[PDB]
Amino acid sequence: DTICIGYHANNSTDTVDTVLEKNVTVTHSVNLLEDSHNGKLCRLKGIAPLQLGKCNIAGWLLGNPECDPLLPVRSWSYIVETPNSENGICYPGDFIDYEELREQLSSVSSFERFEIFPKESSWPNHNTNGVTAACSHEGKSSFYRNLLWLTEKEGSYPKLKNSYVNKKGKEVLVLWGIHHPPNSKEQQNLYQNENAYVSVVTSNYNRRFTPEIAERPKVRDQAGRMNYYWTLLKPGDTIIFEANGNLIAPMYAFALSRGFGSGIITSNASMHECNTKCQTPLGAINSSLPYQNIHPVTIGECPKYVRSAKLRMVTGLRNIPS
Amino acid sequence: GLFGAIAGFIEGGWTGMIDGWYGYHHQNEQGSGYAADQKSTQNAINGITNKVNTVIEKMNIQFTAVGKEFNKLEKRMENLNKKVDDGFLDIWTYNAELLVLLENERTLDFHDSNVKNLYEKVKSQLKNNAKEIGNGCFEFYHKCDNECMESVRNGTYDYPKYSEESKLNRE
């Protein structure tokens, strides 16, 4: 009569590494590293992302004519740019503090596009029909949907001074532009004053802009330049524009809401009818595992990104079916 | 292993023991068979469950983390942001891989120890009423029916009850 003591063996082929030995076949184990995604852009906690289509942030904010106009009000969980964004700034020039603006938009959860300065009503005694071929649409020369190219009317550019009081109860993103002709002849033909200036003030913002005329290499067949500026007008505060030339005036502005967990990602994937708690530029992750090796860029509640190819914890025994 | 049982003086595992990590095989007149030890298996399961869960718990939820952009005159800040992201990534990859290796080693050792401890528990229960025939087995110096076997398995083996007969067979 005999009794023996022994231990479990099974057919498992799971292998784990240890410090003394690599590649040990074990009976039971758990994988801690998520490596699978669904290859789709999804809703994040039930909220769809903001897709900019053919535009980047600049093109969308300035109102580039080539992109399909969005609904007046939007709410999102994250912002998606496409890698090949052909439509951005269409009239050549510098976008001052553009990166900072993107970083601001990274915590915005909603916008309302509203007419801050109505076209036929805000700039009397000035022309508002200025267009350009650098910002073409359907072949014809056009211009930014959110801005207005003010020029001389009937041989004169009278000093304008207009203002907006923010009664939206939220921050209002106001954008404008400053035009820089390549010569003084064009400066006179457009704004009738060689010593022009633009002034923009709020309670906490205070800037003055002066035309700087010089011949420049052609960009998008333009020797002139256009510098783009922006400011966030606090609730209740007032913004004042004052100019006698060169002002690319605001026409539409954005009432902004703040949120958490958002961000801006560059992605190729397509939006699908699906929901997730974790979104990467390559696809969504549905997992409770502590690590992932899919992508460093994550939105929502995601596992920690690591470079590892394998993170497998043994739970069972050294497997010896022999 | 560290305690010398698994892949040690007990060469291999039992494909035929399907209801636990550690256990017994017996052979007597009534027949033979496998029966796992549920107390030790349950203890080991509790331990390793708590280990796995501990590893998962120590890693917090990774909330939103996306890249930033910098203009052509902000190269230093761009490289500093990059140095930060790469540093943190190095450190976490290192931490994860190392923790998994260490804990794997300790887990195999833990199993080895459980098997050895079970063996020793049985040995100390049986004393000289049986002999160690190697490979983790005991040969009784007396008849051990199903009831006797079960008394051994659930830790209530009655040594004096078989002491005489064993002494006689041992001679």
């Binding site: 739970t315 069972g316 | 636990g20 298996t41 349950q42 399961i45 469950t49 796995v52 869960n53 998962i56």
Partner: peptide, 11 residues
């Protein structure tokens, strides 16, 4: 989490 390896386990 649980390691449901045997049905008699307590989990």
């Amino acid at each position: 989490x649980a390691l449901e390896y045997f049905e008699w386990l307590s989990x």
